[PDB]
Design a protein around this nucleic acid. Structure first.
Ligand SMILES: [Mg+2]
Lengths: 210, 253, 42, 119, 180, 86, 54, 108, 89, 50, 162, 50, 226
RNA sequence: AAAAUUUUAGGAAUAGUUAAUAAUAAUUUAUAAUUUUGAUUAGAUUGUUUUGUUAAUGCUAUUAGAUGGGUGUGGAAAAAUAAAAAAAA
């Protein structure tokens, strides 16, 4: 059940290609013309080019060039969060990249949440960091997430994350934050530099003096 | 390794309880030690205060043999076996024990049995192992016959010349073709042996059989209708190779 | 949701099989090409 | 019954009972009118059971049916794809890949619009 | 090792494989069928002009009546005979020195001949296979363990030379006459 | 089982809950005759003879068929007893 | 030093040998190879010897 | 070296050879010195990669605590040097006749 | 042929074989028991192999010794006869 | 799991002590006399063991 | 058809996919035998000619490089400083790939491999006897013993080649 | 087995060859290294009979 | 060759085993070397039911029109987390949630402990790719007390099914180097109270009664009835 | 790797050629090589006691089923019809 003697030897352990029978007969003139036209149709080249005789996937340099030349799906970033998302995709989602996200980068991305769309983008980035990148969250990650949710006014997402944060990666949740999200208490944090409770809706109720 | 073995043996004999440490520090990692090291180190292992420590040391020694390619010797395995009642440590593989039980039982039964003590010529010896037979059966002929144009046959054929007449030859070739070559069809004498193996069979090299009073006991020839060929397909005939083929029918009849 | 091959009994009633010609040789295209270029349609 | 070419289950009604099945001979099977491959399989299964091997194996009918479609010349349990005539996208009628409408897809979604109108 | 392999007759390794003793049959009707015990390669060399390494003998499957009943009668003399030929020296050479393989039908035939014990597949349904228990096996070994030297001598005689001279043979070999 | 004594596990004792399919007593006689008076037997290239070259046919030889029908009976038993006739 | 210690006029030098040509001198047995017996017969294959086809 | 005197494994100062013969003679050389002084005309690259450092774990734990690992690349990039700096006395017992007894930071 | 019992590990794959070579621990234990029973048969096989090898070697020794004796006698006689013929020539 | 020897160089150390000395044919007359005394003593030891 | 096939092979060998596609489309439009189905969409519809871009460069080359390089629409240009480096990298990679010798190719293109042409006078006898012995089996091979018995000469002296 | 050296010397004689002194020395040394003194004596007898 | 089964025994082709020697039989295919393998098919065929019923967003698309509600995004994240560990946790997935990246901790397979098997790997270094669930892990292998001298790569690390028991004492900071665990018989003294050898090179486990009964019933010795 | 044996009624020239070589992968040197003792090209035909017949060393048969572009894999291409064959419990 091995293709050692049924296909050329350069195709050992070859998996995932669309059809490996194409490259067995690519050397014929008609299939060569078809492959060159397909390369032109994919674009990103200034001269007639054809794949190397002993390669099934695209060359590394050609694939990197096309990945760097493809236009972003999002154009005209209205918000600083969208600009940071574009920068993030440029920095980490490059071709064959090896740099990994950091909790500081996640915090910086979350600090720019202004509108619900920005919140959704930040949540997508956080999920990518948790699962695709497998990054352990920092201690204040849940605090930053809760602040980002409250900036837009989205309490259901915060309480869902509290209901199951261990799968999400929040391995430490403050007790006051837990009480606030459960409904035990109405204040979620305290700013010491201002000596003022938050949210402000209960700041005037609790801390009337300063 | 021999010098380190002497040191280990001396430490074991003196009973310093440090021969194991010396072996594990100097000989284990950086030498191709043999099983004699553990043979002696077992004496020191026997002197441990607790049988659990004794067993652990023995098992660790066996693991050392498995790791450092120093297979346990028969003497070491038997030494460990002799203390099986105390340690309950095994030194024979399941396959080896399974083979041994059946073999020992069969050998005991065979030895006790008297009917099968007789020798078996098919099982006891090899008769002849040389590439060539030890006695002359008559072949080769080295001459052709009627209707054989190809003589000599060349490769893989012992025929050396035409049976009856040949173009003129010279010297030793003529001598061989006229006198010296084998001649199976000669009725007076068989092809003679080389000297001196010919003078001692002088009286036996005359004619074929001395009887001349033979009474033919076979089937009578069929005069009519005088069939020509008898190519009967057989089932138990082992001379079918010789039976098949054209042969000249010229005899007393 | 194989193909028969014609046989001809040549000599001693021995069969001969005329297998289809290989698709790579020039003779098939030679047969496909027109016979008279000036007269026949291309 | 584990092989497609020799289905033993098709002849279950032929045998009266366990004793009949296990005392049946190959000549008796041929008299009863059971095809060669099926009766050989039945006899082999009975002999294995007698020797101590119960008929416990893997039913390979589905696997063989799956590997049939790939058109292996020797049925070697390997994947041999068929090369289509028109395989590249440009030669099937598509002049060029469809350029997405970035302006259309950059519009804020309905949930975002409703959230903003609520805010 | 081939693009499209011979599905109707595959093997385990490349050609030509290890020598194997098997009963090659003819292509005739059953009535006149006979087998040839021969040693050949794992892959049949039907292509070349040399097919077998050696010819061990011929076996006749059809039994024949006893043509020697009028001779000195013994027990079961009048039963049908199954005549067969077997080379012994060549078989022992290929089996021991060359270490050739062996099929099951030749193995059964040689089991009848007495050269080899009954084959692995010559199993009856009367008794099932044995069950092995490590503790029982070890107990039996400890009860009946042979001497080291005795076992060494036994295996030396079985494997190395069995024609070991005694003291009498050595003394007879030693010269005693005026040594010239 | 436990001269020599074999281990009961290494040499099992033919489980008693099984049943006997055929026995030495389940055979029946079969008489056949290959008369040379039949030309199809007298023909030289005939397989109906145990002799290769001596003669044709076989005078009233007896074979032994078997009757694997002991299990069709309502009750079937086998009694293992040594022969006492001879 | 690049000249092998086993170098001589015959130039038959055994590489990867660190024993001097004088220190060791014996017909020591070889363990790397294996003895080989003849497998292809010449002429005789079985049954009757007859001439033997030499 | 902790049990036997190696003749030229410990030197007073780095081996001094003319720059012409430096590339020809230095490869294969190996010697120990006191203190982490490095030869000149050598760009220094400290090995901070844990994947590379893991192979020195047994050496650090069982022989001598390994402090620094450095690679020196010459001007022509044709003669590399590997410098391993060990901190602390030898864990293994040291013979008085052993070569490492000479070093101050080894025998201690 | 490697047996694939139904109670092996099922590979839930639509792109390959439906059963895997992994076996239950009982199958491993049963397989060892069958391995032990075949080991009994193959021990006598190797024993007979070595016995036949040594028998063949000893037979070759004896027959070769006898042949060498006879052949030496024959060649001595032949050489003497050849010398006489050469002298006469 | 273990240090092993290589065809190029040996790393596991030798199992038997071997005297590094020339052969008898390369020995000098006095050296061969010393060798002969050693061989006579060796034969004495062998006969004693026998 | 022969001229079309030879020209297409030459264009593919010389790496002219645009010209080869144009020739195939022309053959499909005219209706050349065997080319009635080899019709493909033009992927160079908006692209200018190589001669055009060369003349433009002869007469900003940095800007003209963007026109020279084909974009897929969803592929967008990058700043020219990085574009020049990327183009140099691509040129170096392509030259390195095309400089590698092809084993067993004898320094010949796939169109030149196993391509021997002789005029039809060489095989006219073969053609005539093929269209007689296999008049209704054009794909069958014209082997001897179809037109002559054994021990008898076949019709064509040279037969296959010389 | 050690018998094979003697077997090969006998095979060399049977195949119409003249065993050289190096062959005899190798046979005797191999048999002595295997402990076959009687077989070494047999090799010497073979050399004498040749 | 180097390691035959039952020596040289060619009674049948099956008596040689499924493989002749542990080293690769052909010099040109080093991947044929004998080693313990894992059920990759089952361990990689994750359950799709968790993914079902929850919307997903491709990584490439970042357009606004393809964005989803943040609650849907959160449930997608938790669904993906469940899906990635449905068939078991990866060694990298275990190391990402441990202090000092789990350096110095012991990892073992599910089947490395049951029966007479007692094997674990002490982590020494891990290099994550951009996909944190995959990478390369180097550690020390300890098998029945004996521990290797140098860190080696962990086979089938990416394949899930690993278990770790984190110990704060064994944690090694990135500044230092992970020390190889001591050999129980060689490095540290042998102690029956701390560690006890489960199986020695000649040990064979006794036959389980359930296995014996099953074998006898299959062979037909014991009277198994419906 | 060598030696011998080698067809045609109307018989003649053959050629990526012979040898030498510090030359793998020949920029050189030579009065080179084949052949009327039958060459090369073209026709016929699977080469080395197997058939038939006769008093015959005559005449007359014969699938020993054998080889450069399809994958450089493999120890070895012979690898895409079949050909009675047991292929790792
Ligand atoms: Mg001629």
């Amino acid at each position: 059940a091995s293709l050692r003697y049924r296909r050329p030897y350069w195709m050992m352990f070859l998996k995932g290609v669309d059809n490996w029978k194409i490259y067995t007969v690519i050397q014929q003139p008609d299939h060569q013309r078809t492959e060159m036209l397909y390369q032109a149709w994919l674009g990103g080249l200034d001269r007639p080019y054809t794949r190397p005789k002993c390669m099934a996937n695209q060359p590394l340099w050609l694939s990197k060039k096309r990945h760097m030349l493809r236009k972003e799906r999002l154009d005209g970033p209205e918000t600083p969060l969208e600009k940071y998302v574009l920068e993030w995709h440029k920095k980490f989602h490059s071709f064959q990249g090896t740099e990994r996200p950091t909790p500081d980068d996640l915090h910086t991305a979350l600090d720019l949440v202004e509108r619900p769309l920005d919140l959704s983008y930040a949540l997508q980035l956080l999920g990518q960091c948790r699962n695709l990148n497998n990054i352990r969250f920092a201690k204040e990650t849940f605090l930053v997430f809760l602040e980002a949710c409250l900036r837009v006014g989205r309490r259901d997402c915060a309480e869902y994350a509290l209901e199951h944060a261990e799968p999400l990666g929040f391995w430490f949740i403050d007790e006051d934050h837990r009480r606030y999200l459960q409904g035990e208490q109405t204040w979620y944090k305290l700013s010491p530099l201002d000596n003022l409770y938050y949210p402000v809706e209960e700041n005037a109720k609790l801390n009337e003096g300063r | 390794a021999d010098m380190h073995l002497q040191v280990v043996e001396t430490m074991v004999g003196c009973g310093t309880m440090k021969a194991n440490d010396y072996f594990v520090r100097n000989v284990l990692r950086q030498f191709s030690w043999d099983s004699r090291f553990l043979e002696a180190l077992y004496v020191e292992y026997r002197r441990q205060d607790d049988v659990d420590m004794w067993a652990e040391l023995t098992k660790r020694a066996l693991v050392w043999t498995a790791r450092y390619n120093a297979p346990a010797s028969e003497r070491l395995r038997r030494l460990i076996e002799d203390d099986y009642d105390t340690i309950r440590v095994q030194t024979r593989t399941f396959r080896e024990l399974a083979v041994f039980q059946f073999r020992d039982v069969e050998e005991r039964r065979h030895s006790r049995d008297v009917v099968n003590e007789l020798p078996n010529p098919w099982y006891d010896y090899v008769a002849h192992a040389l590439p060539f037979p030890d006695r002359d059966a008559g072949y080769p002929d080295e001459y052709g016959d009627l209707g054989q144009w190809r003589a000599p046959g060349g490769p893989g054929s012992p025929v050396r010349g035409p049976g009856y007449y040949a173009p003129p030859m010279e010297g030793e070739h003529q001598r061989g073709y006229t006198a010296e070559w084998r001649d199976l069809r000669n009725p007076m004498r068989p092809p003679e042996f080389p000297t001196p193996w010919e003078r001692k069979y002088r009286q036996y090299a005359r004619g074929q059989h001395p009887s001349y009073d033979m009474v033919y006991a076979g089937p009578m020839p069929e005069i009519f209708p005088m069939r020509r060929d008898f190519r009967k397909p057989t089932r138990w005939d082992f001379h079918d190779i010789e039976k098949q083929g054209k042969y000249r029918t010229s005899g007393p009849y | 949701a194989p193909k028969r091959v014609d046989c001809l009994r040549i000599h001693r009633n021995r069969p001969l099989l005329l297998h289809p010609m290989k698709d790579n040789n020039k003779l098939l295209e030679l047969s496909k090409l027109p016979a008279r270029p000036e007269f026949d349609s291309w | 019954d584990i092989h497609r070419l020799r289905p033993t289950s098709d002849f279950k009604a032929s045998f009266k009972d366990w004793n009949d099945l296990f005392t049946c001979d190959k000549r008796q099977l041929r008299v009863r009118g059971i095809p060669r491959m099926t009766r050989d399989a039945i006899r082999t299964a009975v002999q294995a059971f007698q020797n101590g091997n119960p008929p416990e194996r893997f039913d390979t009918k589905e696997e063989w049916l799956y590997y049939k479609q790939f058109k292996t010349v020797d049925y070697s349990y390997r994947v041999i794809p068929e090369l289509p005539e028109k395989y590249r996208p440009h030669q099937s009628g598509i002049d060029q890949a469809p350029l997405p409408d970035y302006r259309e897809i950059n519009k804020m979604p309905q949930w975002a619009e409703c959230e903003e109108r609520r805010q | 090792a081939r693009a499209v392999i011979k599905r109707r007759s595959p093997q385990l390794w490349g050609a030509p494989g290890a020598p194997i003793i098997r009963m090659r049959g003819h292509h005739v009707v059953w009535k006149f069928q006979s087998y040839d015990l021969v040693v050949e390669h794992t892959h049949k060399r039907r292509n070349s002009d040399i097919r077998l390494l050696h010819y061990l003998g011929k076996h006749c499957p059809h039994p024949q009546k006893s043509l020697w009943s009028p001779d000195t009668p013994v027990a079961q003399d009048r039963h049908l005979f199954m005549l067969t030929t077997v080379d012994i020296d060549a078989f022992k050479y290929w089996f021991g020195v060359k270490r050739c393989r062996l099929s099951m039908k030749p193995w059964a035939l040689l089991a009848k001949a007495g050269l080899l014990p009954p084959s692995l597949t010559q199993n009856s349904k009367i008794m099932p296979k044995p069950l092995f228990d490590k503790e029982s096996l070890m107990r039996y070994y400890l009860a009946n363990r042979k001497d080291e030297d005795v076992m060494a001598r036994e295996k030396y005689l079985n494997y190395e030379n069995s024609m070991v001279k005694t003291e009498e043979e050595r003394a007879a070999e030693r010269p005693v006459a005026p040594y010239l | 089982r436990r001269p020599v004594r074999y281990d009961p596990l290494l040499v099992p004792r033919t489980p008693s809950h099984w049943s006997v399919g055929v026995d030495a007593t389940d055979v029946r006689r079969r008489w056949q005759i290959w008369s040379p008076r039949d030309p199809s037997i007298f023909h030289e290239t005939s397989t109906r003879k145990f002799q290769d070259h001596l003669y044709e046919g076989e005078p009233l030889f007896m074979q032994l068929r078997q009757c694997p029908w002991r299990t069709q009976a309502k009750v079937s038993e086998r009694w293992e007893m040594d022969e006492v006739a001879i | 030093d690049e000249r092998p210690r086993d170098w001589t006029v015959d130039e038959i030098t055994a590489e990867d040998v660190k024993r001097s040509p004088y220190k060791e001198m014996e017909m020591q047995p070889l363990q790397n190879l294996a003895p080989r017996y003849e497998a292809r017969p010449k002429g005789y294959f079985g049954r009757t010897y007859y001439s033997g086809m030499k | 070296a902790a049990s036997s005197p190696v003749p030229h494994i410990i030197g007073s100062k780095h081996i001094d050879v003319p720059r012409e013969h430096r590339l020809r003679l230095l490869p294969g050389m190996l010697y120990l010195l006191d203190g982490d002084t490095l030869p000149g005309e050598f760009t220094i690259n400290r090995v901070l990669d844990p994947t590379a450092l893991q192979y020195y774990g047994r050496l650090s734990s069982q022989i001598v605590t390994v402090e620094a690992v450095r690679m020196l690349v010459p001007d022509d990039l044709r003669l590399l040097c590997n410098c391993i700096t060990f901190k602390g006395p030898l864990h293994l017992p040291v013979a008085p006749y052993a070569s490492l007894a000479s070093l101050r930071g080894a025998s201690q | 042929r490697q047996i694939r019992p139904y109670y092996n590990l099922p590979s839930k794959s639509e792109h390959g074989r439906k059963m895997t070579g992994f076996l239950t621990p009982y199958r491993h234990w049963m397989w060892k028991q069958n391995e032990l029973w075949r080991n009994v048969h193959e021990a006598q096989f190797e024993h007979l192999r070595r016995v036949y090898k040594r028998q063949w070697l000893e037979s070759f020794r004896v027959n070769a010794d006898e042949y060498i004796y006879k052949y030496n006698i024959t060649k001595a006689a032949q050489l003497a006869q050849w010398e006489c013929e050469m002298k006469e020539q | 799991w273990r240090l092993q020897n290589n065809g190029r160089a040996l790393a596991l150390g030798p199992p038997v002590t071997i005297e590094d000395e020339m052969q008898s044919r390369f020995f000098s007359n006095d050296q061969f006399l010393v060798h002969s005394v050693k061989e006579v003593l060796r034969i004495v030891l062998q006969e004693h063991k026998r | 058809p022969t001229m079309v096939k030879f020209y297409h092979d030459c264009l593919v060998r010389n790496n002219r996919p645009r010209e080869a596609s144009s020739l195939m489309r022309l053959a499909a439009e005219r209706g050349v035998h065997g080319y009635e189905d080899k019709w493909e969409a033009d992927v160079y519809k908006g692209r200018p000619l190589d001669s055009e871009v060369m003349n433009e460069s002869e007469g900003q080359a940095s800007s003209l490089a963007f026109a020279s390089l084909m974009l897929r629409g969803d592929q967008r240009p990058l700043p020219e400083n990085l574009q020049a480096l990327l183009e140099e990298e691509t040129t170096r990679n392509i030259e390195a790939e095309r400089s590698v010798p092809v084993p067993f190719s004898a320094g010949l293109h796939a169109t030149e491999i196993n391509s021997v042409f002789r005029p039809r006078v060489y095989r006219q006898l073969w053609y005539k006897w093929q269209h007689i012995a296999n008049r209704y089996r054009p794909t069958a091979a014209l082997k001897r013993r179809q037109l002559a018995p054994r021990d008898s000469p076949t019709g064509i002296p040279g037969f296959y080649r010389i | 087995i050690p018998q094979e050296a003697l077997h090969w010397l006998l095979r060399m004689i049977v195949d119409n060859f003249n065993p050289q002194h190096v062959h005899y020395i190798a046979a005797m040394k191999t048999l002595q290294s295997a402990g076959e003194l009687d077989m070494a004596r047999d090799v010497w007898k073979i050399m004498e009979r040749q | 060759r180097a390691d035959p089964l039952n020596g040289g025994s060619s009674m049948t082709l099956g008596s040689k085993g499924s493989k002749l020697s542990p080293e690769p039989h052909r010099r040109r295919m080093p991947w044929t070397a004998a080693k313990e393998y894992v059920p990759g098919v089952v361990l990689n065929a994750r359950d799709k039911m968790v993914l079902d019923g929850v919307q997903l967003l491709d990584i490439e698309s970042i357009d606004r029109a393809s964005q989803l509600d943040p609650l849907e995004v959160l449930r997608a994240v938790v669904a993906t987390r469940e899906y990635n560990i449905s068939t078991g946790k990866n060694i990298f997935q275990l190391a990402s949630q441990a202090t000092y990246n789990g350096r110095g901790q012991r990892f073992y397979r599910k089947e490395w402990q049951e029966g007479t098997y007692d094997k674990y790997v002490t982590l020494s270094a891990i290099d994550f790719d951009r996909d944190g669930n995959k990478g390369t892990a180097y550690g020390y292998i300890t098998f029945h007390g004996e521990t290797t001298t140098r860190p080696v790569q962990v086979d089938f690390a990416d394949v899930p099914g690993w278990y770790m028991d984190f110990v704060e004492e064994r944690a090694v900071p990135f500044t230092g180097i992970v020390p190889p665990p001591p050999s129980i018989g060689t490095d540290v003294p042998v102690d029956p109270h701390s560690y006890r050898l489960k199986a020695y090179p000649y040990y064979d486990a006794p036959n389980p009664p359930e296995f014996v009964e099953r074998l006898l019933k299959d062979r037909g010795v014991l009277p198994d009835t419906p």
